[PDB]
Subunit: 201 residues, 4 copies
Amino acid sequence: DSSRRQYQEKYKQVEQYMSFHKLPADFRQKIHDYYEHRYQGKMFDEDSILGELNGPLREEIVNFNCRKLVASMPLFANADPNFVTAMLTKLKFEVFQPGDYIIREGTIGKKMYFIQHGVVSVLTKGNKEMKLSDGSYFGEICLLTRGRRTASVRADTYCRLYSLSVDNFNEVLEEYPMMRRAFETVAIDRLDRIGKKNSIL
Amino acid sequence: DSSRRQYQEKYKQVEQYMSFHKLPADFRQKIHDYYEHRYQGKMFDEDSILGELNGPLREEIVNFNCRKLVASMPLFANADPNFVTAMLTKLKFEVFQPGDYIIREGTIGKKMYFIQHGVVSVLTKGNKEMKLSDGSYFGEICLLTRGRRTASVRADTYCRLYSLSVDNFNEVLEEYPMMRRAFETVAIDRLDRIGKKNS
Amino acid sequence: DSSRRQYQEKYKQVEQYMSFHKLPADFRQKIHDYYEHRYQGKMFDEDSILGELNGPLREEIVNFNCRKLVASMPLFANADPNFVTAMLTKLKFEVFQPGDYIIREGTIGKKMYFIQHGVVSVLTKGNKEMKLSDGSYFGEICLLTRGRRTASVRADTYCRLYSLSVDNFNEVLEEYPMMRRAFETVAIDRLDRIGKKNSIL
Amino acid sequence: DSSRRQYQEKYKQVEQYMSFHKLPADFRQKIHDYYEHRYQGKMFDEDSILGELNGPLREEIVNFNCRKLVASMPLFANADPNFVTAMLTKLKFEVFQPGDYIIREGTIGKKMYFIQHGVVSVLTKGNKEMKLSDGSYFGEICLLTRGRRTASVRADTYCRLYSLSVDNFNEVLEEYPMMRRAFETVAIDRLDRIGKKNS
Ligand SMILES: O=c1ccn([C@@H]2O[C@@H]3COP(=O)(O)O[C@H]3[C@H]2O)c(=O)[nH]1
Ligand SMILES: O=c1ccn([C@@H]2O[C@@H]3COP(=O)(O)O[C@H]3[C@H]2O)c(=O)[nH]1
Ligand SMILES: O=c1ccn([C@@H]2O[C@@H]3COP(=O)(O)O[C@H]3[C@H]2O)c(=O)[nH]1
Ligand SMILES: O=c1ccn([C@@H]2O[C@@H]3COP(=O)(O)O[C@H]3[C@H]2O)c(=O)[nH]1
């Protein structure tokens, strides 16, 4: 209803914005396709909806909303239910298109990504490409070690991801410190592959 | 008028959201019941409204609105009207449904709760249940001690509660440091019952 | 136009809010009278208007908007034009009604007030009442000394004031440090009256 | 469409505000001219729009939108495309009218400015004027040195400028510390001209 009307009205705005800034045709279609895949014809002010509720309802919703991600992520498959719930309530749903550089090597990293659906290539200067898909995560090394992105990460298909900010990452880890090790273990394997023998983890 | 219509429009938007996210029907009904009890057909941007006023008017409005809560609460009984006002200004209104766990034993606590109307059960592994009702509060132990929750608290009825965050709690206690003692006395008696001591 | 329509629509909301919370009749009329005196039938999103402009236009507007206050305040009558402009751009216009306690003794003070128009009584426990009016300011002692309100301040008439927050106060004073003395001088006179011989100033 | 109407509705609201505050007619016309040049009949919540997108799309859009600025600016000439993107992401678009003092000698500086289109005069007490135009920047000295503005800068034409705050400047320079040198070199040459040295 109004959710569809909000999609339509906001897409209208986007169109006007693009025409005003004279974006080329190919990019306008890309933006079109992004809205369609990201929102599917509906837009909600989720933060204001969830804000209207209480903690327990909010908990149940984030838990059900992220059921697919939870299922496919062994980090989550197995864990303490309060840890999961704390993680989930901080995640931000993001959609990426084929070709997008989600992460650029050498930049400073402020977030990590969990793959619900899609395929990404990890491109490290100095090494071969490798691929990550459903139930993998990436970007954890900068959150753990606060240095620079050790590789680029590029979407190969439409990717539905959930991002976590560094500050949120540390908020959750200060509460469930025993869970840090799980990230670190994955991080050490990846650092080993790219020739960083790394004690900090 | 527009506030009844704002409720109507908002609840349709919630229905649309639940359908999009494919939530199960009984959850959908749970959510419908929550809105009915929480908002009772009307919605307001209270932040926008209050923010259009001045301090004296907001103070007056908060005291008036919480006059029943305040009279029910022994904490406010002997108390400085400025401490009362400081507290009220910082409370967030919340409603819970029967069987909701407001608090879970073992988790980290960031808020405490005052009861305006309803009954809750305090569920402590290792001890008998106890009930709390109108004008008591709970959840204060982790705000004082920064430990884990010592008990679960479950809504037995519909509960209308006002929550106070740990940051606001400290702020107002920084301001009225004589009032910390009242909370400590209660906390101490409940720690005694569950066989705990804390220096 | 829409400014009047926004007043009317927002006053409607207020009315609904009050009926819902069952406020008594006398207080509803007080709120009515407040809207009428504060807004005069018009409402603007000033922050969004001023946000649309640039610095120089913004400067000219705050300067003209506060012409009356500037005129009647010797602190301002005389001062460096950049200091004034910096002060003005931080002030918040507030209206108070006869009987209002603007400030309560013993509380912690986070703002001071400049009187554009109106009369206030300063009520110190332990001393006689005194009055302040157009071109006076009050509440400066807590901003300077960060302790407790040394007296209550109650509106006797409709008062049109401009408030300044402590953080804004210090922001401006870190830039124009030579202006602090002016507040301190007034503060010392008032502290003397209420029996606080005070070196901190 | 709605963005043309948003301009119309917004400008009526500005007219209402100016009438309420009793601003003089020529100021009222000044403000009318500013809106015409700044917004050119359309208004958008760019924050809301961009915020609906993702990082890759916002990056693409910012680079596309600033392609002329970037090509005009020698600072970006040899530069890492990630440093360029970091900077662009932090710029705020601003327009000034002829005779506006963008900066006043002697005041405290919190921002610097890049010129996309227009000419400014640099007015230094004690020295001859100089002009700056498309692709130069100014106001960088106080961002580096945290002193007072060493000169006034006045708009001679309509000026379309992008501003960068001191906090954002440091943030991006924290990230690309090799780029600080470029700003220093310019700053040093301008300090030389006004007979100043700084260790
Ligand atoms: O051989 C490798 C090297 C790295 N990576 C990922 O790429 C990410 C880039 O950002 P980051 O450096 O914050 O985290 C990195 C890892 O998650 C990988 O999966 N396999
Ligand atoms: O015997 C008992 C034990 C506990 N309680 C309450 O349950 C609360 C759970 O969270 P918390 O640990 O921060 O605070 C606790 C108290 O407010 C109680 O009333 N009686
Ligand atoms: O004899 C007196 C005593 C005090 N006062 C004012 O009352 C104010 C109360 O708040 P404050 O303590 O932050 O600042 C105080 C002064 O500005 C006054 O005008 N005359
Ligand atoms: O001879 C001169 C002197 C100065 N300037 C510029 O004017 C600016 C004024 O503010 P600021 O002091 O932060 O930075 C200064 C420079 O960018 C210049 O281009 N040539």
